[PDB]
Amino acid sequence: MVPGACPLILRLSPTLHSADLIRDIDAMRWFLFEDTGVPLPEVNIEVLPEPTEKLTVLLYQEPVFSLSIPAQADYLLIGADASVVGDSQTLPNGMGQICWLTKDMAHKAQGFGLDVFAGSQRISALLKCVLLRHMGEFIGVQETRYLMNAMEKNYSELVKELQRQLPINKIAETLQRLVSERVSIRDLRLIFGTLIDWAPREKDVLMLTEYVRIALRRHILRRLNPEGKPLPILRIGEGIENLVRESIRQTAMGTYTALSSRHKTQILQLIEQALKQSAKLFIVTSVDTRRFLRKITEATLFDVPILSWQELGEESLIQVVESIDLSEEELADNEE
Amino acid sequence: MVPGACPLILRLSPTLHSADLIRDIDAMRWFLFEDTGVPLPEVNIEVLPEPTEKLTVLLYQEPVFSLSIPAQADYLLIGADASVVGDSQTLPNGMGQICWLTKDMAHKAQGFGLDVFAGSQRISALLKCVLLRHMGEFIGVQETRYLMNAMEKNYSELVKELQRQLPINKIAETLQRLVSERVSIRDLRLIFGTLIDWAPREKDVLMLTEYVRIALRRHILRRLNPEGKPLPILRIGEGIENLVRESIRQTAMGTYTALSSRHKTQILQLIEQALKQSAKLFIVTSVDTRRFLRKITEATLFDVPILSWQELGEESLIQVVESIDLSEEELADNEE
Amino acid sequence: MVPGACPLILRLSPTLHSADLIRDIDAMRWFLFEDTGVPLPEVNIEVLPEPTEKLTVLLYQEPVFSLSIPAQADYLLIGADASVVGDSQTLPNGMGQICWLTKDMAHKAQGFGLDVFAGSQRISALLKCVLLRHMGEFIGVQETRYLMNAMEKNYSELVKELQRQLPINKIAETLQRLVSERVSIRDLRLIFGTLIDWAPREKDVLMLTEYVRIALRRHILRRLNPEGKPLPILRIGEGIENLVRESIRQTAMGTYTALSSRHKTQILQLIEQALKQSAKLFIVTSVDTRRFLRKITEATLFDVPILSWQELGEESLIQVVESIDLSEEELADNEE
């Protein structure tokens, strides 16, 4: 009886276990830390004797992932495309797609310019995927405390000033909000500086997160697209922007949105209908409506990034693909 | 004369005592801790010389369970079903049902896919049942203090921040309220984080418990149904919802419900009449009426879970079975 | 997993690496410190095995510079002019221009009175260029703390009085604002004295930065032109000055500018059109409009210096080249 659930459990059949799985998992953890700034806890491996090849991932002892690999599962390719086809299944909780390939098909797919995993790697490519879906569950008050203690080696004055400006709960909330939107918190020096700059003039954690996002726009654009090539952008029309802006209500803890269920459902439906034509799109809205749009779209569309006009500079061309726009619904259908 | 009643006493006849009873009881305690997050105290075994095979369970020296096993009691099956029939009695305080089976009938029931206990196990399966009915009696201020002290090994900052936000009596009240509704408090890290997040914006312990329940909805649904198969759902109609919502009165300590005895009795009667058609149903109501419905139904219907719409996500289909709805009674019978 | 991104990474192919690169880089860092007052962190050299000669510069692990040198790249000349022509490419993020020259052409260009780099020097001349574009990213609260601690050896009383007058966040903000406009902070004694003088009478960090700029006008003019020869000056007309002055709005944290997007775009367009006739021009405006003009022109025109009338004394002749002037746009086009 030890209070506190074990953070990370990976349960595997004895066949799936390998001698190099530990180092492979550690390398995946180091890659995730470098890519996101979130230091993950150690993965606890549990060998489960089972005739059927099954693997499960439990976060804090709650099963979040389960998958039975087929008997022919020897080469794995995350995602789907035209050049590769065969033995494709969709992972639960809308993580993405996985394809199982034979040796020659895996070789030709690797030659095509894709990553193919064999052996223990196939486990990591799965675990990493799951770990990428629940990153925000690994950054809280204690983890923020750990990051701040680590930052005191070279930035003792910065950490002291940040603590002078904000309590640890607000810092943890800001870091968690950043992590939940796939924004890396690797650059703690810049994030802490931005929080110090804006804390006296702003008490709302959501607005502080928006300011930090603006300060990190270089990294956000670098991660969204490695190259300067024009990636498609879907603009939110002025009708939706004003509809969501008029719903902003301010209380002592900051501003929230007060929109009807019909409105949110119709914007979500039209956005989803406007997302099926291409694999990836970036939704761009105004500065004062980006966070509210995200929080009314994060429940269903979690993997789509919501960008703000201030988050893209004037040195990047926009290549607008579509322009989604609607007016109110309850008062009058209007555009909807 | 030692002040403080002994928490857990199991009194057995010498025949029922076994050499492996201690380890069996300890395993049951470890299972209960893993399933509920509540660390139970040590069970004190008292051998009572009696010609009649009897066992009693006393919580804090008050007899809460008593049962005389028959002479043919050698295989025990908790619950009732169609495939198994014979020597069935109903446990007191509406715990459930117990069936005593012969060797061949126990073998066929085990083959049918049920759990059958023989020997000392039959005691534990009974004790565990009793322990599952009075879990909320083992989580108080001292037990909350113990859990927080245990959590300080890896989450010292989290515990310090929680103490900064809330006094120990409110934390204990929240934990007890969670335990009383069969919500596991195993994930203390998430519960403490939610309490830290919502404590500045909310002083009502019931509302804080509701927020923690919302944060734990993944585990709640996982426990209510292990699989994704559609389990039946009984919706509370809008008439009952508005009737109970109009009765909300707010004082300095928070909001309570002020409903007539006739109203509560009629809702309880109709809910019970709507529960007899199937073995298990999940009552689903609005967010602002879930706690009040629970506290007006917990006295009689303790084993039925009251869920809120926010507690089920949009990724689960609802399969509505019935729609209970009534208007007021005293002003006019209306639907009732 | 070490929290805190590595500040300075230079990634080179093994061919570009040299035995004297370390000392060359250190000399460049000492020159930059002497010229700007900003102590740079150590450059971390990473040798990347690649068939193509490529070099990248990453600030806090974010790639900010990338360039593939050609096979004939043996002599490098930063900038462009009439006497030198051949193999010229433009660096990204509008840093400037680079020209690759052959041995005899490099010799004749050096004789013409220009600096030509061969070997490891060609790397530094590139890195320095990049380091000159992002100097403001190396001066924050921790770096300000370091400079103040260094200043306590000979100016303990001055540092104590400055701390008595201002908190470290405001001092860091002032230093960063000075560095971002290519104003050296080498003379910390004078900057701290000015901040002590003006802190009781002024709480706005932007106004304090303006006062420090006024106190440092001797160095600013010395850096802008080494000689007393007449360098061209572009005056901002009274219409633009009054248009931007009427937009000044004051809140509890100081004064900001509230101008329409059309206004800012038209002033930027006319300034850019008025900058193409000559290689270098100095924009001169009023004292109360210099900072606002800079902050509405820094995003696009970062390398052009915005001067104030108080920043030039009466001992220097002005040699006005152009007089840009416009009225409002939205109310009426007027001059625009």
Author numbering:
A (entry chain E), B (entry chain A), C (entry chain I): 346 to 681
Give the authors' words.
The inner membrane export gate protein, SctV (InvA in SPI-1 and SsaV in SPI-2), is the largest component of the injectisome and is essential for assembly and function of T3SS. SctV comprises a highly conserved N-terminal transmembrane (TM) domain and a less conserved C-terminal cytoplasmic domain (SctVC), which are connected via a ∼20–40 amino acid linker, SctVL, in most bacteria using the T3SS. Consistent with other reported SctVC structures, the SsaVC monomer also has a four-subdomain (SD) structure and further assembles to a nonameric ring aligned to SD3, which is the most conserved region of SsaVC.
In this study, through generating a chimeric protein consisting of the TM region of InvA and the cytoplasmic region of SsaV, we produced the full-length SctV in a high-order oligomeric state which was adequate for structural study using cryo-EM single particle analysis. A homogeneous and oligomerized ISS protein was eventually obtained in buffer containing the detergent Glyco-diosgenin (GDN); however, SsaV (similarly to InvA) could not form the stable nonamer in this condition. Unlike SsaVC, for which we obtained high-resolution structural information, the EM density of InvATM is blurry, and the SsaVL EM density is absent, with an approximately constant distance between the cytoplasmic domain and TM domain; this is consistent with a recent study. Consistent with the observation above, B-factor analysis of the SsaVC structure also shows that SD3 is the most stable region of SsaVC with the more flexible SD2 and SD4 floating around it. In each SsaVC monomer, the hydrophobic pocket at the connection region between SD1 and SD3 is occupied by a hydrophobic peptide (M346-V347-P348-G349-A350) from the neighboring SsaVL, forming the hydrophobic interactions between two adjacent subunits.
